[PDB]
Amino acid sequence: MEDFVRQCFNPMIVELAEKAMKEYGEDPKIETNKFAAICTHLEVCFMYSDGGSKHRFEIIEGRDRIMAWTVVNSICNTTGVEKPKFLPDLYDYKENRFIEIGVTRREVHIYYLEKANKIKSEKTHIHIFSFTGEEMATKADYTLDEESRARIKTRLFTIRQEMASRSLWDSFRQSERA
Ligand SMILES: O=C(NCCc1ccccc1)c1nc([C@@H]2CCCN2C(=O)c2c(Cl)cccc2Cl)[nH]c(=O)c1O
Ligand SMILES: [Mg+2]
Ligand SMILES: [Mn+2]
Ligand code: NA
């Protein structure tokens, strides 16, 4: 599965995932399922931000902590929206709201509730994807057009199928916790 991650994801995504794991004392070569999950969430965040028009989204995920908060605090001062307690994943300039992106190996409704209870940021918009084409967004408001969403869901399904063809999926599928 370490080989799978390194050939499947772009090298900057892989480097970011490695850093994120090591910042919590985890070895990407050992906790390989976690390695893959972080890479997938990152790739989805980047795909999401490419989904609209140029300049529609600001990417917050994937930045070091100081720059990420400089972006958040800047947006809050420029648009007046409330400052979140946790770093979200994107800001949407069209809808003027932060977005929290979730990618789950379990079911989208359970993950949605968990995310909602965890952030408790009434104003942050939540959008969840699964590896089997399901999604769940706040107020059933999905932000992107169906073509963009289809691209994301299609990529997640491809990853899922690739893992399965290597007998890695069932270990990966059961590795997520609440
Ligand atoms: O922004 C995120 N993380 C900010 C930093 C952070 C770090 C720890 C706890 C809270 C926040 C973030 N994180 C996760 C999931 C659940 C929380 C951890 N995690 C990871 O992927 C993960 C990371 Cl980052 C590093 C090592 C191991 C893991 Cl398992 N899911 C998201 O959708 C998401 O946006
Ligand atoms: Mg995040
Ligand atoms: Mn997220
Ligand atoms: Na989070």
How would you describe this protein?
- The protein is α+β, with helices and mostly antiparallel strands and 178 residues long.
- The protein has one domain: Influenza RNA-dependent RNA polymerase subunit PA, endonuclease domain (Restriction Endonuclease), CATH 3.40.91.
- It is built from seven helices and five strands.
- The protein has a five-stranded mixed β-sheet with strand order 1-2-3-4-5, sandwiched between helices.
- 29% of the residues are buried.
- Bound molecules: the ligand O=C(NCCc1ccccc1)c1nc([C@@H]2CCCN2C(=O)c2c(Cl)cccc2Cl)[nH]c(=O)c1O, magnesium ion, manganese (II) ion and sodium ion.
- Residues 20-21, 24, 34, 38, 41, 61, 87, 89, 101-102 line the site of the ligand O=C(NCCc1ccccc1)c1nc([C@@H]2CCCN2C(=O)c2c(Cl)cccc2Cl)[nH]c(=O)c1O.
What is this entry, summarized?
Helices cover 50% and strands 13% of the residues. By secondary structure, the chain is of the alpha+beta class.
User: Which small-molecule species are bound to the chains here?
Assistant: the ligand O=C(NCCc1ccccc1)c1nc([C@@H]2CCCN2C(=O)c2c(Cl)cccc2Cl)[nH]c(=O)c1O, magnesium ion, manganese (II) ion, sodium ion
Number of helices: 7
Separation, N- and C-terminal Cα atoms = 23 Å
Q: Which CATH architecture is right?
A: 3-Layer(aba) Sandwich
Shape: globular
- Hey, roughly how much beta strand do the residues contain? 5-15%
- Report the CATH topology name: Restriction Endonuclease
Helix content: 40-55%
Text of the CATH class: Alpha Beta
Secondary structural class: alpha+beta
**Largest sheet composition:** 5 strands, mixed
Q: Strand sequence of the main sheet, in spatial order?
A: 1-2-3-4-5
Query: How many domain units?
Result: 1
Q: What's the total number of strands?
A: 5
PDB class: hydrolase/hydrolase inhibitor
Keywords: nuclease, transcription, cap-snatching, virus, hydrolase, hydrolase-hydrolase inhibitor complex
Assembly: monomeric
Entry title: Crystal structure of the influenza virus PA endonuclease in complex with inhibitor 7a (SRI-29770)
